[PDB]
Amino acid sequence: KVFERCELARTLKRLGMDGYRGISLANWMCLAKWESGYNTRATNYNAGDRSTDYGIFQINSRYWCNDGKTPGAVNACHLSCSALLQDNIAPAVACAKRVVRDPQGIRAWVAWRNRCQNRDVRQYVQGCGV
């Protein structure tokens, strides 16, 4: 599914992402925007290390979900990577929460640093009633 901006913002708020481990909702919005364009079925293969990025938050198979074909990988979220391609984002949200519980926090995603860190991110939630 391809979410509309305000629909996603309301969904994430309900799922308790606003302020999770100090990350504002607008940051999570900025991340989903640049990682997948708010698309839950997005997948990106990394030919370089044989891992794959899955779903709305482009979560990596080397550490977070099991896809079976990534060498020397772990599954910290305890999920099949398939779970991250559903229209229902609850499993993807639970995994993203697990990712930020690690020391790097939101910085774990390079796209966040390039596109969201130190910028005016209010734009992503403006007028959504969140």
From Swiss-Prot:
Taxonomic superkingdom: Eukaryota
GO MF, one annotated term: identical protein binding
SUPFAM superfamilies assigned to the protein according to its UniProt record, in alphabetical order: Lysozyme-like
Gene3D superfamilies with a match to the protein in the record: 1.10.530.10
Gene name of this polypeptide: LYZ
Example of a GO biological process term: antimicrobial humoral response
C-type lysozyme domain location: 1-130
Annotated catalytic residues: E35, D53
UniProt keyword list: Amyloid, Amyloidosis, Antimicrobial, Bacteriolytic enzyme, Disease variant, Disulfide bond, Glycosidase, Hydrolase, Secreted, Signal
Record bears the keyword rRNA processing: no
Location(s) in or outside the cell: Secreted
Record field: catalytic activity: Hydrolysis of (1->4)-beta-linkages between N-acetylmuramic acid and N-acetyl-D-glucosamine residues in a peptidoglycan and between N-acetyl-D-glucosamine residues in chitodextrins
Name of the protein in question: Lysozyme C
Family, similarity comment: Belongs to the glycosyl hydrolase 22 family.
Entry's EC annotation: 3.2.1.17
Cysteine pairs bridged by disulfides in the record: C6-C128, C30-C116, C65-C81, C77-C95
Recorded disease: Amyloidosis, hereditary systemic 5: A form of hereditary systemic amyloidosis, a disorder characterized by amyloid deposition in multiple tissues resulting in a wide clinical spectrum. AMYLD5 primarily affects the viscera, and the predominant clinical features are renal dysfunction of varying severity, and intra-abdominal bleeding. Inheritance is autosomal dominant.
Remarks, miscellaneous: Lysozyme C is capable of both hydrolysis and transglycosylation; it also shows a slight esterase activity. It acts rapidly on both peptide-substituted and unsubstituted peptidoglycan, and slowly on chitin oligosaccharides.
Subunit (UniProt): Monomer.
UniProt cross-references to SMART domains, sorted A to Z: LYZ1
Principal location class: secreted
GO cellular component terms attached to this protein's record: azurophil granule lumen; extracellular exosome; extracellular region; extracellular space; specific granule lumen; tertiary granule lumen
First-level EC class: hydrolase
Role, per record: Lysozymes have primarily a bacteriolytic function; those in tissues and body fluids are associated with the monocyte-macrophage system and enhance the activity of immunoagents.
UniProt cross-references to InterPro entries, sorted A to Z: Glyco_hydro_22 (IPR001916), Glyco_hydro_22_CS (IPR019799), Glyco_hydro_22_lys (IPR000974), Lysozyme-like_dom_sf (IPR023346)
